[PDB]
Ligand binder design. Sequence first.
Ligand SMILES: CCCCCCCCCCCCCCCCC[C@@H](O)O[C@H](CO[C@H](O)CCCCCCCCCCCCCCC)COP(=O)(O)OCC[N+](C)(C)C
Lengths: 175, 69
Amino acid sequence: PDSWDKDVYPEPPRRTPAPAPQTSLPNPVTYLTKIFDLLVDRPVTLAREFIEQQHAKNRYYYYHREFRRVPDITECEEKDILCMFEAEMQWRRDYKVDQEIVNIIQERLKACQQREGESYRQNCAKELEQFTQVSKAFQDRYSDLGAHYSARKCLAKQKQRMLAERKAAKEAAAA
Amino acid sequence: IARTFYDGPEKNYEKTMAILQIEAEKAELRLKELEVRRLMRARGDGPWYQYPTIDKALIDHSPKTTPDN
Ligand SMILES: CCCCCCCCCCCCCCCCC[C@@H](O)O[C@H](CO[C@H](O)CCCCCCCCCCCCCCC)COP(=O)(O)OCC[N+](C)(C)C
């Protein structure tokens, strides 16, 4: 339904075939599902309708909290405690958001694997590629920081990787 | 529960800022005091580590029965 964004959690157009009876015998599944409908789905629907009627008479709202951007750890002086504190809080929030991004991608992958059935090895290639890219980026950002991680250690890791990449590029240039 | 028992995040955030400022200033002051103590004890040119010397007011500046003191 409309509870979630359908672009963040996409699904295929859901093609399902029409019944094609070939036997004169009746279908026990159809009879049982008609009984289930009439005996289960209607009272539950009525209870939900009553509950939603009660809810509509009391409509109140909650809001998503907004955070502005503060200077990063790169723009902080060495011993400036306040700027470091704000930058560290911002970095921790970004870390949580990145974890949730990875979680969304993994949810997509799992759903595709279940959905595609016997053809999952070929029909889930795109989700697997997206997970591979996101996992590589996340591993580059946050892996091996250890317990007691911080923004400063992440910055040191990025600087080390940048130095290695610059050296490799200059050595390949001399080839 | 939030309305009855707790405050918003800004209170804890800014209280943390104040606490961090106080503690950082105290640490800097401690290091500065140690350095000042070292310098004052090494040179003896400050108010601290002043050890007594003989008072010059004890000297008698009178003729001493001999011209050459
Ligand atoms: C209604 C049913 C559905 C929901 C049920 C929810 C269950 C919740 C009830 C259980 C109690 C939760 C534990 C209480 C911990 C709170 C302690 C403290 O943190 O809260 C103080 C609040 O003090 C309250 O008075 C706490 C009182 C709770 C004490 C429990 C006593 C129960 C004893 C049972 C006695 C029953 C009869 C005994 C017969 C002998 C905060 O003081 P304050 O400085 O303002 O904070 C400022 C924040 N402001 C701005 C939002 C106000």
